[PDB]
């Protein structure tokens, strides 16, 4: 088969920046290449077709340039909602091959996390179990650190965490964390912490409620 | 406008077989043939092959061929991929794409997603994540609901049927140490609004047939 490798595997570009992004065929495909954007959760779009033409609707600060074994991808000027993973892919020769994808984030300016937190539910108690959620809101970058403290003793291995892809519009991240208790150890403490470290934090915020109240 | 609309996806036992529809619009059907791509989770696309809508003639990647095969209904403009003796591996988004034969493929269905696994269907919990007393006069505050332990993937949600999706933050799902899945929607709103406006997520599970209106509102 034709192996198609992208490079880079990830890049991280602020909005306006001229952006290109490589793919390399292990053969000779003479311009039968196109590329695709799939942004999460979403089928890929086709962008381009016989390495250079773009597909109707497409914005013009989409190009591709190559022929041979060599060929990019470039955005004149990368707005917030190109975020995606871009995939090349030949058609010179069944299989049809693709390139690995070359993962486009959003550089922006620092922005601090806005934080909460939920007790269990009254409901779920009844079942025997509760979620502690903590929720860090539209920060920038994704790096953060999050510690939950149950009267002080604090708490490994009972938590997940989960974060939401780039926003589309204003490039933040959005992040929870879900700490998981009997409904019996639950009630045997009172005070439930969450503390987050950021960069656009001067020091660690901490949301904080005390069973039952 | 051209579409192409996937299903017959979902959860699948080892050793089992599913028969995925697309069912294309907007275009001649038979004008183009059409691709099967698949994308296991966090991987990247794999060309399963291609057919030939005029005729119905197949054309298969090695590494499937025999134990998928491609057919038509060209009356309902439809496509299908029937996967067979299925294993763990096999789990992956499955996408139709239109396109003809050796070439690019200029568009494809929404995915659906197969599950490969002896376990269960369940359906989610869903508990509310009630906004704060506390939240700030004249301010902004957070709630959500908490869609907790159902099998497989995935589920959908909304806010106040669709009406609301500012601020709206689903999470990808975590499986957790028991095999269920879990994850959280939120959504930041005025704190003016709280016991104003109502604040209802609706959870559909198709998989375990399971929908749910869940309100959430300030606790007593």
């Known amino acids: 088969d034709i192996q198609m490798t992208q490079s880079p595997s990830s890049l991280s570009a602020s909005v306006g920046d001229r952006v290109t992004i490589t793919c390399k065929a292990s053969?000779?495909?003479?311009?039968?290449v196109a590329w695709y954007q799939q942004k999460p959760g979403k089928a890929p779009k086709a962008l381009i077709y016989?390495?250079?033409f773009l597909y109707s609707g497409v914005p013009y600060r989409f190009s591709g340039s190559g022929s041979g074994t060599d060929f990019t991808l470039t955005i004149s000027s990368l707005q917030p909602e190109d975020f995606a993973t871009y995939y090349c892919?030949?058609?010179?020769?069944?299989?049809?091959?693709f390139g690995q994808g070359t993962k486009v984030e959003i550089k922006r300016t620092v922005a601090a996390p806005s934080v909460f937190i939920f007790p269990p539910s009254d409901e779920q108690l009844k079942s025997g179990t509760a979620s502690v959620v903590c929720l860090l809101n539209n920060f920038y970058p994704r790096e953060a650190k999050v510690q939950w403290k149950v009267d002080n003793a604090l708490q490994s291995g009972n938590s997940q965490e989960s974060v939401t892809e780039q926003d589309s519009k204003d490039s933040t991240y959005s992040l929870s964390s879900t700490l998981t208790l009997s409904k019996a150890d639950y009630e045997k403490h009172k005070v439930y912490a969450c503390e987050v470290t950021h960069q656009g934090l001067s020091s660690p915020v901490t949301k904080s409620f005390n069973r039952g109240e | 406008e051209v579409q192409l609309v996937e299903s017959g996806g979902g959860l699948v036992q080892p050793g089992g077989s599913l028969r995925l529809s697309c069912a294309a619009s907007?275009?001649?059907?038979?004008?183009?043939?059409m691709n099967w791509v698949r994308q296991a989770p966090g991987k990247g696309l794999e060309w399963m092959g291609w057919?030939?809508?005029?005729?119905?003639?197949?054309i298969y990647a090695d590494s499937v061929k025999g134990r998928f095969t491609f057919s038509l209904d060209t009356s309902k403009s439809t496509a299908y991929l029937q996967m067979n003796s299925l294993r763990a591996e096999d789990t992956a988004v499955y996408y139709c794409?239109?396109?003809?034969?050796?070439?690019?493929?200029?568009?494809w269905g929404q995915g659906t997603l197969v599950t490969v696994s002896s376990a269960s269907t369940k359906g989610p919990s869903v508990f509310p994540l009630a906004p704060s007393s506390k939240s700030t006069s004249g301010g902004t505050a957070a709630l959500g609901c908490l869609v907790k332990d159902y099998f497989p993937e995935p589920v959908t949600v909304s806010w106040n049927s669709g009406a609301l999706t500012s601020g709206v933050h689903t999470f990808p799902a975590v499986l957790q140490s028991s095999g269920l899945y879990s994850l959280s929607s939120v959504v930041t709103v005025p704190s003016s609004s709280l016991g104003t406006q109502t604040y209802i997520c609706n959870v559909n599970h198709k998989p375990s047939n399971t929908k749910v209106d869940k309100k959430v509102e300030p606790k007593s």
């Open positions: 794409a239109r396109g003809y034969r050796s070439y690019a493929m200029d568009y």
């Open positions: 907007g275009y001649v059907f038979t004008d183009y043939g």
């Open positions: 057919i030939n809508t005029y005729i119905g003639e197949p």
């Open positions: 053969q000779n495909v003479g311009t039968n």
């Open positions: 016989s390495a250079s």
């Open positions: 892919q030949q058609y010179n020769i069944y299989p049809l091959t």
